[PDB]
RNA sequence: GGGGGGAACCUGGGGAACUGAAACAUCUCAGUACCCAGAGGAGAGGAAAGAGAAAUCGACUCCCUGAGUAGCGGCGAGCGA
RNA sequence: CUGUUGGGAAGCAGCGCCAGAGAGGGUGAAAGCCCCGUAGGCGAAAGGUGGGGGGAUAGGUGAGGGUACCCGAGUACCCCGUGGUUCGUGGAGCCAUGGGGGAAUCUGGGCGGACCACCGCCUAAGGCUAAGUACUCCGGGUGACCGAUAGCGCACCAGUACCGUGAGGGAAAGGUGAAAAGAACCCCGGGAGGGGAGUGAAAUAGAGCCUGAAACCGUGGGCUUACAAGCAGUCACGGCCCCGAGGGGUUGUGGCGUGCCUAUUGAAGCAUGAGCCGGCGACUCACGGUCGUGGGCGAGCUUAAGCCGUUGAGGCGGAGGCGUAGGGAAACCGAGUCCGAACAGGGCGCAGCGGCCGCAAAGUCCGCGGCCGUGGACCCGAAACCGGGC
RNA sequence: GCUGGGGCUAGGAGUGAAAAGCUAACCGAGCCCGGAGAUAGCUGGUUCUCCCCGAAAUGACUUUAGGGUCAGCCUCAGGCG
RNA sequence: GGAUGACCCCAGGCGGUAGGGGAGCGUUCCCGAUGCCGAUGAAGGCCGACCCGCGAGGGCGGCUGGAGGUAAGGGAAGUGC
RNA sequence: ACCCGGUGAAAUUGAACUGGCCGUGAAGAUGCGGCCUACCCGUGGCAGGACGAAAAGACCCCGUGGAGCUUUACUGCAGCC
């Protein structure tokens, strides 16, 4: 959810940027690794419950 | 797991049957329609669920029966849906029409009537109606039927 | 509203690419409708001429052929280096072309 | 667009719990004076339509 | 102040037939196609002599649902709140 | 930035650098950093808009008490003839009104599906009223949209040429090259055209220009053919030619042998269609249904419109729908129910596998597939019917 | 009588010394555009490959008879054995 | 047989129109892809007596061509004359 | 008309390496069988055949196709009473 972090990484060819509210499986399966905020980890836990 | 590993299970996505695309396919030329006649035609054939070649149909030769209604239509009267005793066991304390509506057992806009299939619990049930058998069972397992309107 | 032209008649430019890469020369002319420039001494092609006034001998002449404007880069007259063009608003308010390397003006 | 319910069938026919089709017996609308009590009595009941005809009618009743 | 124009859209005044009913006339197609008048950036509608059964709601328009229900129908084909 | 191959670097190689910018397009081939851009920012003297913020103006406002003055007229209302509505004369109300008759001002009048009572709802015969809705001439953004027979009828000087008296009909036609460097001059020729020279990385890229298939035409070569009977091939063997215990091309002789498609009981058929080639050309989509199937959940399953978010992110939303109970025309009853006088008889109905944990399953949702219904519904084709014009 | 120029009458309508003649080179109902992709139980046509199975031209009814509905006969899936 | 297509063994079936079923080929487009092939030559074209495949087809090599193409695995259709 | 110079169409056309008899064949065969006959290619002519060309038979029947017309067919409407 930190937009400064998202602005800083989003132009790297090997990085896809999301806010946790946008977490979707296609972008998960698209990418080889999954890096998350604890604040986004929290949102993830809330949605799959 | 990678994007290239995503695949449906066998048989989940079947391929369509394509007609009129050559002799090898088993469906060429006539496209499985046979030869000539209605029904082989674009648009062919009257509704096979009814039509019978001009004779009086199986349906229309049977007689009418019952009140069909008349303008201005259906008469407004109270309606009943029945819920059996066995479907009350998930409940504790007191079952209501609103609570039974929430559970997915009773449909909105239906007065409640309790029926006798199943066994009675020590529940305080609030219903518009009770079958005789549903009363006796409830008034015997320590249940508290509450008729109302 | 206009064809953007990063190079002018007749500043000094490097031809950065093509057969004449590395050449330094004066912009003889700028062709906005073609997004081209002509650089003195670069892109010399042999044009055939009929006997006539101006060429009573016939034969051929030499002609500078045009260059696509993106093959060309001004040489900054301050530091003498080829550079991209920046914009800068003067004290009066006018904008001028300056050097991305040092900062000198290119006119 | 969505199928329309055939009202002729809806007024003649009932689909039972297991999906049979039931109709009133035919033949006592009139001309009854010289039919036996057995014939009047037996035609007074419903019956189960033959299977092919039953499936045709059921398709005309998509929202029962 | 009016006149005339404007791709579609809108309202009002008029308003078919092929077709479907495996013929055909009621019915259907359909108040559709089309003609005409007018309006405008929209138009119509609109502040209950309403709904309809809740001792209730609360202008009108528009979407979802109600619902292919209620009913209508040479109780046929179909039509349809 | 450099080196390198190359006509050309953006390729390949070395060493760097920017990124709130690695969307995209160009540049001589394939470029984040060369160009145009992109992210992120900035901008109107004048005209238009301004539904938002502010300010004005118009405008707006009590209680009992008595009085019974007023409360929309050829109207309500009734009858005749009709329209509208789901209502086709139906028990036919309601709303509208062409004809006739024709009130009252609240103690008045209309409605709740003939009618009457009761009980309630509402105030007719004057007008106006944003927003949410529709459309796409216009502008922009975006495509598991087209890519010159496609996509608009028109990528191009197209509603043109041309056709028609007229309404009206209505085409074909895109590409040299990186750059015109578009071939000076000489030669044959009236010219056209060609041969040289020249340009170019390439000139069967030379303008009748990218690629340049096929039918079709021609030139040259190999084999073959003038005693021979044929759906034109095939099987065999031999001869010649070609590439190097094999193969290719050719065919003299011998054996066998009734084109394709369509329609038919039956066709080589003297029955249909096709001159030949290239290109276009016919079972689809929406919504419902019905079976099957791949998964999710399971007495439950599932949302719709919208709302928020995003800018190829997804979530919210439970209204509603299907299922959980049936039988009966219905009142109604209910694991039953209906017919019946019945405790009769009958119709239609009612009842998981393994050790509380697990698997499975009613059902339901989505995906897929077969087929059905509605639509023009596999494509092409009438003779005709109707409307408005010419 | 023939003829120039200027005019009027047209689609279920004109005009016709009458042939259903003529109304812009086919008139027992003009043309154009539209409804419109009318409808056609008729005729044609329907495009890659391989593998397994494999019919029918009968019965009943049908304003039906060269068209249909059901049955018969083919095929596939699950079940029975 | 080995053990759930791991391949082998032996056995039997395998004419086919309407038609049912099954398995595949190829065309356009999307994900895969800020990737990968590509001027040491993309697509398309013209040959081939070679390789794989039952076949539809796929390879490979020579010539032309001169800037595009696009895998394993999946998705969608204006998909084969 | 024919010959030479100039210019140069057409309908049609599955492909053709396209003979006779007597048979056979979907019943009238250049194309099947058996025999007979026949070197290759044209030009001027004739019309017996190619069930020759042209035109999806007008006759005829069939279609629950169409249209014109008629009447004491049906049902309407104008008009008139
Ligand atoms: Mg990125
Ligand atoms: Mg990025
Ligand atoms: Mg990536
Ligand atoms: Mg991304
Ligand atoms: Mg992004
Ligand atoms: Mg982001
Ligand atoms: Mg994002
Ligand atoms: Mg991965
Ligand atoms: Mg599919
Ligand atoms: Mg299909
Ligand atoms: Mg299949
Ligand atoms: Mg095929
Ligand atoms: Mg084939
Ligand atoms: Mg078949
Ligand atoms: Mg077929
Ligand atoms: Mg065929
Ligand atoms: Mg057919
Ligand atoms: Mg079939
Ligand atoms: Mg099928
Ligand atoms: Mg058929
Ligand atoms: Mg079929
Ligand atoms: Mg057929
Ligand atoms: Mg047949
Ligand atoms: Mg048949
Ligand atoms: Mg056919
Ligand atoms: Mg038939
Ligand atoms: Mg037929
Ligand atoms: Mg058939
Ligand atoms: Mg059919
Ligand atoms: Mg059938
Ligand atoms: Mg139909
Ligand atoms: Mg039809
Ligand atoms: Mg009959
Ligand atoms: Mg009812
Ligand atoms: Mg600038
Ligand atoms: Mg240099
Ligand atoms: Mg120059
Ligand atoms: Mg810059
Ligand atoms: Mg200035
Ligand atoms: Mg200046
Ligand atoms: Mg200076
Ligand atoms: Mg409808
Ligand atoms: Mg009925
Ligand atoms: Mg009934
Ligand atoms: Mg009767
Ligand atoms: Mg009776
Ligand atoms: Mg009698
Ligand atoms: Mg008797
Ligand atoms: Mg008796
Ligand atoms: Mg009796
Ligand atoms: Mg009897
Ligand atoms: Mg009785
Ligand atoms: Mg069956
Ligand atoms: Mg159904
Ligand atoms: Mg059904
Ligand atoms: Mg329902
Ligand atoms: Mg006017
Ligand atoms: Mg106006
Ligand atoms: Mg309108
Ligand atoms: Mg109107
Ligand atoms: Mg209107
Ligand atoms: Mg009329
Ligand atoms: Mg009609
Ligand atoms: Mg009609
Ligand atoms: Mg229709
Ligand atoms: Mg009809
Ligand atoms: Mg019909
Ligand atoms: Mg008829
Ligand atoms: Mg009709
Ligand atoms: Mg009608
Ligand atoms: Mg219609
Ligand atoms: Mg109507
Ligand atoms: Mg319209
Ligand atoms: Mg608006
Ligand atoms: Mg408005
Ligand atoms: Mg008011
Ligand atoms: Mg309302
Ligand atoms: Mg109130
Ligand atoms: Mg009120
Ligand atoms: Mg309100
Ligand atoms: Mg409902
Ligand atoms: Mg009706
Ligand atoms: Mg109807
Ligand atoms: Mg109606
Ligand atoms: Mg209607
Ligand atoms: Mg309404
Ligand atoms: Mg070099
Ligand atoms: Mg370089
Ligand atoms: Mg490099
Ligand atoms: Mg970006
Ligand atoms: Mg883009
Ligand atoms: Mg780019
Ligand atoms: Mg690259
Ligand atoms: Mg690029
Ligand atoms: Mg690329
Ligand atoms: Mg770039
Ligand atoms: Mg880029
Ligand atoms: Mg911006
Ligand atoms: Mg900007
Ligand atoms: Mg701005
Ligand atoms: Mg304000
Ligand atoms: Mg107020
Ligand atoms: Mg006041
Ligand atoms: Mg007051
Ligand atoms: Mg008074
Ligand atoms: Mg009043
Ligand atoms: Mg008034
Ligand atoms: Mg009156
Ligand atoms: Mg009244
Ligand atoms: Mg009367
Ligand atoms: Mg009336
Ligand atoms: Mg109505
Ligand atoms: Mg009425
Ligand atoms: Mg009516
Ligand atoms: Mg009524
Ligand atoms: Mg009234
Ligand atoms: Mg009146
Ligand atoms: Mg009152
Ligand atoms: Mg009163
Ligand atoms: Mg009233
Ligand atoms: Mg009343
Ligand atoms: Mg009321
Ligand atoms: Mg009442
Ligand atoms: Mg009211
Ligand atoms: Mg009022
Ligand atoms: Mg208004
Ligand atoms: Mg509005
Ligand atoms: Mg636009
Ligand atoms: Mg645009
Ligand atoms: Mg394309
Ligand atoms: Mg073209
Ligand atoms: Mg075009
Ligand atoms: Mg082309
Ligand atoms: Mg195309
Ligand atoms: Mg255009
Ligand atoms: Mg346009
Ligand atoms: Mg065109
Ligand atoms: Mg032109
Ligand atoms: Mg003309
Ligand atoms: Mg003409
Ligand atoms: Mg003209
Ligand atoms: Mg025309
Ligand atoms: Mg064109
Ligand atoms: Mg070309
Ligand atoms: Mg070019
Ligand atoms: Mg180049
Ligand atoms: Mg000269
Ligand atoms: Mg000369
Ligand atoms: Mg000379
Ligand atoms: Mg000379
Ligand atoms: Mg001369
Ligand atoms: Mg010359
Ligand atoms: Mg020459
Ligand atoms: Mg020359
Ligand atoms: Mg050279
Ligand atoms: Mg040359
Ligand atoms: Mg070439
Ligand atoms: Mg070339
Ligand atoms: Mg090129
Ligand atoms: Mg060429
Ligand atoms: Mg050529
Ligand atoms: Mg050639
Ligand atoms: Mg050629
Ligand atoms: Mg030649
Ligand atoms: Mg030769
Ligand atoms: Mg030779
Ligand atoms: Mg001899
Ligand atoms: Mg010889
Ligand atoms: Mg011979
Ligand atoms: Mg010989
Ligand atoms: Mg052959
Ligand atoms: Mg032979
Ligand atoms: Mg031999
Ligand atoms: Mg040999
Ligand atoms: Mg040989
Ligand atoms: Mg010889
Ligand atoms: Mg032989
Ligand atoms: Mg033969
Ligand atoms: Mg064939
Ligand atoms: Mg035939
Ligand atoms: Mg025949
Ligand atoms: Mg047959
Ligand atoms: Mg013949
Ligand atoms: Mg023949
Ligand atoms: Mg014939
Ligand atoms: Mg033939
Ligand atoms: Mg025939
Ligand atoms: Mg044919
Ligand atoms: Mg032809
Ligand atoms: Mg031709
Ligand atoms: Mg040919
Ligand atoms: Mg062809
Ligand atoms: Mg289909
Ligand atoms: Mg479709
Ligand atoms: Mg689809
Ligand atoms: Mg569906
Ligand atoms: Mg469905
Ligand atoms: Mg389905
Ligand atoms: Mg399903
Ligand atoms: Mg689930
Ligand atoms: Mg489960
Ligand atoms: Mg019932
Ligand atoms: Mg009783
Ligand atoms: Mg009993
Ligand atoms: Mg019983
Ligand atoms: Mg029983
Ligand atoms: Mg399931
Ligand atoms: Mg079906
Ligand atoms: Mg349709
Ligand atoms: Mg149509
Ligand atoms: Mg059709
Ligand atoms: Mg269909
Ligand atoms: Mg008619
Ligand atoms: Mg008529
Ligand atoms: Mg007529
Ligand atoms: Mg007219
Ligand atoms: Mg006129
Ligand atoms: Mg005269
Ligand atoms: Mg005169
Ligand atoms: Mg005259
Ligand atoms: Mg005159
Ligand atoms: Mg006159
Ligand atoms: Mg006239
Ligand atoms: Mg007419
Ligand atoms: Mg007319
Ligand atoms: Mg006369
Ligand atoms: Mg004309
Ligand atoms: Mg004419
Ligand atoms: Mg004439
Ligand atoms: Mg005539
Ligand atoms: Mg007529
Ligand atoms: Mg007529
Ligand atoms: Mg006519
Ligand atoms: Mg005429
Ligand atoms: Mg005309
Ligand atoms: Mg029109
Ligand atoms: Mg129209
Ligand atoms: Mg229509
Ligand atoms: Mg048509
Ligand atoms: Mg018809
Ligand atoms: Mg027909
Ligand atoms: Mg045809
Ligand atoms: Mg065919
Ligand atoms: Mg099988
Ligand atoms: Mg078999
Ligand atoms: Mg028969
Ligand atoms: Mg049989
Ligand atoms: Mg039979
Ligand atoms: Mg018949
Ligand atoms: Mg007969
Ligand atoms: Mg008949
Ligand atoms: Mg047949
Ligand atoms: Mg027929
Ligand atoms: Mg059948
Ligand atoms: Mg059997
Ligand atoms: Mg079966
Ligand atoms: Mg089995
Ligand atoms: Mg068995
Ligand atoms: Mg074997
Ligand atoms: Mg066997
Ligand atoms: Mg075997
Ligand atoms: Mg077989
Ligand atoms: Mg099949
Ligand atoms: Mg695409
Ligand atoms: Mg990509
Ligand atoms: Mg590479
Ligand atoms: Mg290279
Ligand atoms: Mg391609
Ligand atoms: Mg190729
Ligand atoms: Mg094979
Ligand atoms: Mg190949
Ligand atoms: Mg090579
Ligand atoms: Mg190639
Ligand atoms: Mg390129
Ligand atoms: Mg691809
Ligand atoms: Mg793949
Ligand atoms: Mg197609
Ligand atoms: Mg396919
Ligand atoms: Mg094909
Ligand atoms: Mg001579
Ligand atoms: Mg001559
Ligand atoms: Mg000559
Ligand atoms: Mg000439
Ligand atoms: Mg010709
Ligand atoms: Mg041949
Ligand atoms: Mg031949
Ligand atoms: Mg011969
Ligand atoms: Mg011959
Ligand atoms: Mg001969
Ligand atoms: Mg015979
Ligand atoms: Mg013979
Ligand atoms: Mg012969
Ligand atoms: Mg032969
Ligand atoms: Mg033979
Ligand atoms: Mg023979
Ligand atoms: Mg012979
Ligand atoms: Mg012979
Ligand atoms: Mg002889
Ligand atoms: Mg001659
Ligand atoms: Mg001759
Ligand atoms: Mg001759
Ligand atoms: Mg002859
Ligand atoms: Mg003759
Ligand atoms: Mg002859
Ligand atoms: Mg013949
Ligand atoms: Mg003859
Ligand atoms: Mg013939
Ligand atoms: Mg012929
Ligand atoms: Mg003729
Ligand atoms: Mg025809
Ligand atoms: Mg015929
Ligand atoms: Mg004819
Ligand atoms: Mg006749
Ligand atoms: Mg006949
Ligand atoms: Mg006839
Ligand atoms: Mg009939
Ligand atoms: Mg018939
Ligand atoms: Mg008829
Ligand atoms: Mg008629
Ligand atoms: Zn500088």
UniProtKB/Swiss-Prot annotation, chain A:
- Quote the protein name from its UniProt record: Large ribosomal subunit protein uL4
Task: Name the source's superkingdom.
Answer: Bacteria
User: After translation, how is this protein modified?
Assistant: The N-terminus is blocked.
Assembly: Part of the 50S ribosomal subunit.
Similarity comment: family membership:
Belongs to the universal ribosomal protein uL4 family.
TM stretches of this protein:
none
- Function field: One of the primary rRNA binding proteins, this protein initially binds near the 5'-end of the 23S rRNA. It is important during the early stages of 50S assembly. It makes multiple contacts with different domains of the 23S rRNA in the assembled 50S subunit and ribosome.
Q: Which gene is transcribed and translated to give this protein?
A: rplD
UniProtKB/Swiss-Prot annotation, chain B:
Q: Which Gene3D superfamilies match?
A: 3.100.10.10
Q: Where is the composition biased (Basic residues)?
A: 30-39
Q: Which PROSITE patterns match?
A: RIBOSOMAL_L15
Q: What's one Pfam family here?
A: Ribosomal_L27A
Give the UniProt entry's GO cellular component terms.
cytosolic large ribosomal subunit
Which processes are annotated in GO (biological process)?
Answer: translation
PANTHER family in UniProt:
50S RIBOSOMAL PROTEIN L15, LARGE RIBOSOMAL SUBUNIT PROTEIN UL15M
Gene that specifies this protein = rplO
Question: Region (Disordered): which ranges?
Answer: 1-60
Q: What does this protein do?
A: Binds to the 23S rRNA.
Species of origin reads: Thermus thermophilus (strain ATCC 27634 / DSM 579 / HB8)
Any one GO molecular function term = structural constituent of ribosome
User: Compositional bias (Basic and acidic residues) at which positions?
Assistant: 44-53
Q: What is this protein called?
A: Large ribosomal subunit protein uL15
InterPro entries from the xrefs? Ribosomal_uL15 (IPR030878), Ribosomal_uL15/eL18 (IPR021131), Ribosomal_uL15/eL18_sf (IPR036227), Ribosomal_uL15_bac-type (IPR005749), Ribosomal_uL15_CS (IPR001196)
Entry keyword annotation includes Hydrolase: no
State the source organism's domain of life. Answer: Bacteria
Listed under subunit, the entry gives: Part of the 50S ribosomal subunit.
Q: Which family does it belong to?
A: Belongs to the universal ribosomal protein uL15 family.
Does the keyword Transmembrane helix belong to this entry? no
Keywords attached to this Swiss-Prot or TrEMBL record, sorted alphabetically, are:
Ribonucleoprotein, Ribosomal protein, RNA-binding, rRNA-binding
UniProtKB/Swiss-Prot annotation, chain C:
Q: Does the keyword RNA-binding apply?
A: yes
GO molecular-function term, one example from the UniProt record? rRNA binding
Q: Does the keyword Chaperone apply?
A: no
The protein's matches in SMART domains, at most eight in alphabetical order, are given as: KOW (SM00739)
Q: Which UniProt keywords apply?
A: Ribonucleoprotein, Ribosomal protein, RNA-binding, rRNA-binding
According to its record, what are the GO cellular component terms? ribonucleoprotein complex; ribosome
Give the source's domain of life in one word.
Bacteria
Do you know which Pfam families this protein is assigned to? KOW, ribosomal_L24
* Signal peptide range: none
In its UniProt record, which GO terms are filed under biological process? translation
Q: Which family does it belong to?
A: Belongs to the universal ribosomal protein uL24 family.
Q: How does it assemble?
A: Part of the 50S ribosomal subunit.
Known function = One of two assembly initiator proteins, it binds directly to the 5'-end of the 23S rRNA, where it nucleates assembly of the 50S subunit.
NCBIfam families in UniProt: rplX_bact (TIGR01079)
The protein here is known as Large ribosomal subunit protein uL24
Organism of provenance: Thermus thermophilus (strain ATCC 27634 / DSM 579 / HB8)
From Swiss-Prot, chain D:
Keywords from UniProt, A to Z, are: Ribonucleoprotein, Ribosomal protein
Record-linked InterPro entries: Ribosomal_bL35, Ribosomal_bL35-like, Ribosomal_bL35_CS, Ribosomal_bL35_sf
Report one GO cellular component: cytosolic large ribosomal subunit
| Record bears the keyword Iron-sulfur | no
Gene3D superfamilies from the xrefs? 4.10.410.60
PROSITE patterns for this protein = RIBOSOMAL_L35
Lineage, top-rank taxon, reads Bacteria
Give yes or no: UniProt keyword Methyltransferase: no
Its Gene Ontology molecular function terms?
A: structural constituent of ribosome
Which cysteines link up through disulfide bonds?
none
Q: Which GO terms describe its biological process?
A: translation
Q: Summarize the subunit comment.
A: Part of the 50S ribosomal subunit.
> What family does the entry list?
Belongs to the bacterial ribosomal protein bL35 family.
Its protein name is Large ribosomal subunit protein bL35
């Amino acid at each position: 959810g930190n937009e400064l972090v998202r602005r800083a990484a989003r132009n790297l060819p090997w990085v896809v940027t999301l806010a946790p509210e946008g977490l979707n499986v296609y972008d998960i399966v698209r990418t080889e690794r999954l890096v998350m905020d604890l604040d986004a980890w929290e949102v993830f836990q809330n949605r799959i419950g | 797991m990678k994007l290239s590993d995503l695949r449906p299970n066998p048989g989940a996505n079947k391929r369509r049957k394509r007609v009129g695309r050559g002799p090898g396919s088993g469906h060429g030329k006539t496209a499985t329609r046979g030869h000539k006649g209605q029904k082989s035609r674009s648009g062919g054939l009257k509704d096979p669920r009814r039509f019978e070649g001009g004779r009086s149909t199986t349906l229309m030769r049977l007689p009418k029966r019952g009140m069909q209604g008349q303008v201005p239509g259906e008469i407004k009267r109270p309606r009943y849906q029945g819920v059996n005793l066995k479907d009350l066991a998930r409940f504790e304390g007191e079952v209501t029409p609103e609570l039974l509506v929430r559970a997915g057992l009773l449909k909105k806009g239906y007065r409640l009537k309790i029926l006798g299939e199943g066994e009675a619990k020590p529940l305080k049930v609030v219903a518009h109606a009770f079958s005789k058998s549903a009363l006796e069972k409830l008034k015997a397992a320590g249940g508290e039927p509450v008729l109302l309107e | 509203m206009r064809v953007k032209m990063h190079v002018k008649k007749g500043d000094t430019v490097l031809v950065a690419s093509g057969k004449y890469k590395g050449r330094v020369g004066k912009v003889k002319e700028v062709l906005p409708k073609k997004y081209a420039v002509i650089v003195e001494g670069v892109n010399i092609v042999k044009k055939a001429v009929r006997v006539s006034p101006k060429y009573p001998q016939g034969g051929f002449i030499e002609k500078e052929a045009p260059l696509h404007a993106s093959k060309v880069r001004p040489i900054c007259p301050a530091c003498g280096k080829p550079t991209r063009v920046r914009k800068k608003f003067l004290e009066n308010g006018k904008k001028i072309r300056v050097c991305a390397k040092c900062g000198g003006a290119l006119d | 667009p969505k199928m329309k319910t055939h009202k002729g069938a809806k007024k003649r026919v009932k689909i039972t719990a297991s999906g049979k089709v039931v109709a009133m017996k035919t033949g006592k609308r009139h001309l009854n004076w010289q039919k036996s009590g057995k014939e009047i009595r037996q035609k007074g009941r419903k019956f189960v339509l033959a299977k092919p005809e039953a499936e045709r009618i059921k398709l005309l009743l998509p929202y029962e």
